[PDB]
Structure formats: structure tokens, C-alpha cells
Design a protein around this ligand. Structure first.
Ligand SMILES: [Zn+2]
Ligand SMILES: [Zn+2]
Ligand SMILES: [Zn+2]
Ligand SMILES: [Zn+2]
Ligand SMILES: [Zn+2]
Ligand SMILES: [Zn+2]
Ligand SMILES: [Zn+2]
Ligand SMILES: [Zn+2]
Ligand SMILES: [Zn+2]
Ligand SMILES: [Zn+2]
Ligand SMILES: [Zn+2]
Ligand SMILES: [Zn+2]
Lengths: 39, 84, 100, 85, 102, 40, 5, 14
């Protein structure tokens, strides 16, 4: 998981809980924080 | 990867300036750089000058000066998250 | 003249604004013999004028360019004119702007 | 019509392509393919797998069929397009 | 020297056979200053020798080439050396063939 | 639908009913293509 | 023109 | 100055 500033096992918001109103997207997979609809 | 990466041009000799204002409205909030002509314009949540640039030029790939992510207007998705 | 070339994949969609057959060269402003790049849609003069299109190819690597004089497509790598279904849209939209 | 390996493709040689070209290794004229990076002609997996062997040595991903003019990408393990000369 | 360039996408997987740091130029046979193309993996000499790689780039459009002397990557379009995560595998496999270590 | 020989065939909208119109095999106004399952 | 571009 | 430490006659690559 990479922060908007550049800094760096099985449900949904549980991943965001560890890091919550601002979300991310990357692509389940055995492996990034954006600002949604780009451009 | 996306089929529009072909449109991408080399980084200018001058390099990229993360603090560059919009070429049309001068704003410094949420700016993006075009990877084909390297012009800087604001996002859709601002005044939408890069959307307007895409409409005029057809240039598909833009890079955010906020989080360095690449958006493809045709694929309507972020392509990669590689950055300077 | 090729019926296909491995570089047709590099051809991008026609910009929303459309194509302008009377567009001058982006570098020298001339209106004689210009080509449009089918990947980034920038307009530059041909080899017989000031070669700004071939200079664009050198810098970008963009292989396919369309003549605004005779609506033919040249591939810089294949060093030949290419004729293929992929070029129908680009040639149509351009012909419509050149004639009607 | 797109895969991330089309970058490896080279221009068609000045001499052109010869659909009747035999496999460079075994000389067979049944089921041959042409490499779109180096333009060498080799047989497919069903015959003697000389093109698979070439891919292993070169890393060259895209090959074109001399039977049905289709384009296979070894990495994508799929037919990428069917545009043909 | 760039931390990224828009041409890194053109980099292909290292061939199953691997890389041979001692491979001569495919055109002139020289063993001094050779580069490997990171898209088609053909080996040709640098610009200061006979420039068969400058030629290969001219013909193919392939932007990224790796030095068999110092293991650096040059982008012909960006006209600069590029260093990035994308080039780690290529540089590793090449270093192992040149030295034995990663 | 394009034949292995290069010819183009011209009735539809996950079955063998499509192959029946054309028979023992390769899988809008979109174009279908006849090949050989595993290339190279 | 025999040579394009 | 930086001669002790940009990086040694490398020039344009490729
Ligand atoms: Zn795209
Ligand atoms: Zn603006
Ligand atoms: Zn642009
Ligand atoms: Zn272009
Ligand atoms: Zn000009
Ligand atoms: Zn071509
Ligand atoms: Zn592929
Ligand atoms: Zn064989
Ligand atoms: Zn090959
Ligand atoms: Zn580059
Ligand atoms: Zn040489
Ligand atoms: Zn190459």
C-alpha cells in the first residue's frame, strides 16, 4: 500500500482500517492510494 | 499496460515541475501533466482544462501532480503508478 | 505499398475536435505539404519541406503519419505506404474535412 | 488487437515475407510461423516446436501463422490479433 | 539520470536462455562496448564503437538498451540514463552472468 | 466470421448453433475468427 | 511523392 | 569539489 505522498490476508474496509474516509484502487490478489476518477 | 501508451513522448530536457500551474486558469490545486505534449492543466474536480485538452488533442495519458498516477482518458482507468 | 504492417497497433483514436487538413506545421508554420501523426495527432511538414514530421518521429518513435495532400499513410519503420482497415476511420474523417 | 508485447515487433524486411518458407531448423513445409521481431521462419508446437525453441532462446514474443495469418503471443498465451498481409 | 521515463513499458521479459554479457555485436562482431535491447534482446555495439544499437533503435523504435560494460540503461527518446524497479530483474540476471553475484 | 483461408462469411444473438450455419473448430456487427487453439 | 513522411 | 565524489568520461549511452 502506497500513500498519496509517495510513502510505503482474506476483507473490504479491513485493509483501510490498518492505514478511513479517503479510498484506493489497485488493478483479490496475493501482492495504491489515489483520488478516484482521474484526469 | 493500456493500448494508448504509444501516444507518450519523451520527458522534456527541462524536466517536469510538480508545482506548475494550469496553463489556462493558473490554479495550483489538482494539476496534471500531459504525457504527449507536456502541457499542464487542472483536473475535473477543478475547472477541467485537461479534459478540454484531451478533447482538443486526443492525447490519452495524463500524470497527476498530486499522487503521480497515470490516467488514460480512453481506458477510463489509472494505468500504472510509476513516478519521478 | 503494404496491405498491413506491424505498427498499425500504434494508431490512436481521432481526437474529439476532429482533423483539420489546412492545419500549418507545428514547428515552422508552413501550409505546404503537411502530415498528421496517427498516435498523437500533431501536425508537421514533410521531408521535402522542412522535415518536422520526420523529426517528430525521431523524438517520439510514432510510426504512422497521414498526408494532408493525398491522404496516404506512411510507416517510418517499414519505410512504405500502408493500406489497411485500421486506417479507414482516419482517412474518412480527413476526406470529409478536405472535401465534404 | 493489443497486448503489452507488441513493442518487441520489428518492421517487415525489405525482401518481404514468404508464406512458403520452410522451417529454418527441420526444413518442413507443414505448419510454419514467422517471428515478428527477427523474421525467422520456424515450425509450430504440433510439428517440431522449432518456433517454441526460438522463443526460449530469443525471448521474442510475437509470431505470425503462415497457415491462417493469425498472431500468437507466447507470454500472453493467446491470439492477439488477426490483421494480415 | 531519470528515476522513471515513459518508455519503461517497452521493456520485455529476460529470455529463458538468459543474457550473455560476452555476446558480440550482431552486425560487426566486436566485443568492445555492446548493449542489449530490452524489447527484443538483440546485442549491438554502442555509439562510440560502430553504433549498431543506434541503428537498431532507428529501425525498430525500441527505446531501452542495457550496457554490458557498466549495466546501465539508456532511453534513446528521453536521451538519458534511466534507473527504476522495472530494470532490477534485467540488471540482476546480467550482473550474475558478468560476475556470479546479484 | 473469417475462414482459415482468408474468406469472410456473413443470424445470431455459448453454443454450436453458430458453428452449424458455417463443422468438426475455433472460437453485434463484430468479427469472429477461425484459427487453431494453441498457437506457436 | 515516392517517399512519405 | 564534486570530483572527489557527477560519475566517471561516461557520456551519452547507447
Ligand atoms: Zn488506454
Ligand atoms: Zn485550469
Ligand atoms: Zn497533450
Ligand atoms: Zn506523434
Ligand atoms: Zn515544418
Ligand atoms: Zn510499420
Ligand atoms: Zn503479449
Ligand atoms: Zn521445425
Ligand atoms: Zn525471433
Ligand atoms: Zn524514455
Ligand atoms: Zn557493431
Ligand atoms: Zn530491439
Amino acid at each position: 500500500v502506497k500513500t498519496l505522498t509517495g510513502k510505503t490476508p482474506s476483507t473490504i474496509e479491513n485493509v483501510k482500517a490498518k492505514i478511513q474516509q479517503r479510498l484506493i484502487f489497485a488493478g483479490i490478489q496475493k501482492e495504491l492510494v489515489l483520488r478516484l476518477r482521474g484526469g | 499496460w493500456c493500448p494508448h501508451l504509444v501516444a507518450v513522448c519523451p520527458i522534456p530536457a527541462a524536466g517536469l515541475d510538480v508545482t506548475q500551474p494550469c496553463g489556462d486558469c493558473g490554479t495550483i490545486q489538482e494539476n496534471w501533466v500531459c504525457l504527449s505534449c507536456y502541457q499542464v492543466y487542472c483536473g475535473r474536480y477543478i475547472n477541467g482544462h485537461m479534459l478540454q485538452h484531451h478533447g482538443n488533442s486526443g492525447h490519452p495519458l495524463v500524470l497527476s501532480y498530486i499522487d503521480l498516477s497515470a490516467w488514460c482518458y480512453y481506458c477510463q482507468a489509472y494505468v500504472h503508478h510509476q513516478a519521478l
